[PDB]
């Protein structure tokens, strides 16, 4: 029931108190006032939902692992997991809603368009991971297409060392490997992103240094692990 400055700032307090549901509700509200978002705001938004979704994905994997261990005992692993699955599809649809109605439609500068298109790939990625065969083809295809389009824009309009361009390549590679079981693709995608970024490690901006090198190290972490 309040004002951008107010909501943005309960979002930060919610973050510190690790109440990420509160944090995401705060930034959803600032998103819906339609005013396009700071970089500060976009990031609090992304962080809030990554943690909100991440909790349910972690819980789903725990409950899944256990189902791989009584006609009605397993009937409960199934009922509980599906409770989590539903939570996770609701979260993803709320974020997908905001992306299509508010953030992508106002994405003026190419930085922003790439960011939100990645998020769209991310959250269709997470739906795909529990998706029910009917949708699963559509959430995959939505995922790849959001990603490819962010991929295209980012190659043409951003430096190989931009952290957003790199994080996109990180997650797209993960999408190939874990959603489209194409390690050859994922691995090639991750190699080229790392390689084109390091090649331009003399113009990597100071402002970006910590984030871009972290993401470059994770690409390398995942390339190493995908070859074990």
């Amino acid at each position: 029931t309040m004002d951008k400055s107010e909501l943005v700032q309960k979002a930060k307090l919610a973050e510190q108190a690790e109440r990420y549901d509160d944090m995401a509700a705060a930034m959803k509200a600032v998103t819906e006032q339609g005013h396009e978002l700071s970089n500060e705001e976009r990031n609090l938004l992304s962080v809030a939902y990554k943690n909100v979704v991440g909790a349910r994905r972690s819980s789903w994997r725990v409950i899944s692992s256990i189902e791989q261990k009584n006609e009605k005992k397993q009937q409960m692993g199934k009922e509980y997991r599906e409770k989590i699955e539903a939570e996770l599809q609701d979260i993803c649809n709320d974020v997908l809603e905001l992306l299509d109605k508010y953030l992508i439609p106002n994405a003026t500068q190419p930085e922003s368009k790439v960011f939100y298109l990645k998020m769209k790939g991310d959250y269709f990625r997470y739906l795909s991971e529990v998706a029910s065969g009917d949708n699963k083809q559509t959430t995959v295809s939505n995922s790849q297409q959001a990603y490819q389009e962010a991929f295209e824009i980012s190659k043409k309009e951003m430096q190989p060392t931009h952290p957003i361009r790199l994080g996109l390549a990180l997650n797209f590679s993960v999408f190939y490997y874990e959603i489209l079981n194409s390690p050859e693709k994922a691995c090639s995608l991750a190699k080229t992103a790392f390689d084109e970024a390091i090649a331009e490690l003399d113009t990597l901006n100071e402002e970006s240094y910590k984030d871009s090198t972290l993401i470059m190290q994770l690409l390398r972490d995942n390339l190493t692990l995908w070859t074990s």
Binding site: R61, S65, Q68, D221, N222, L225
Partner: peptide, 20 residues
């Protein structure tokens, strides 16, 4: 940073493991 990278590895590893 070590924290971040190791959580990532655990997350990517769960896939190579529990659904191979």
């Amino acid at each position: 940073r070590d924290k971040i990278r190791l959580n990532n590895a655990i997350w990517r590893a769960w896939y190579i493991q529990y659904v191979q």
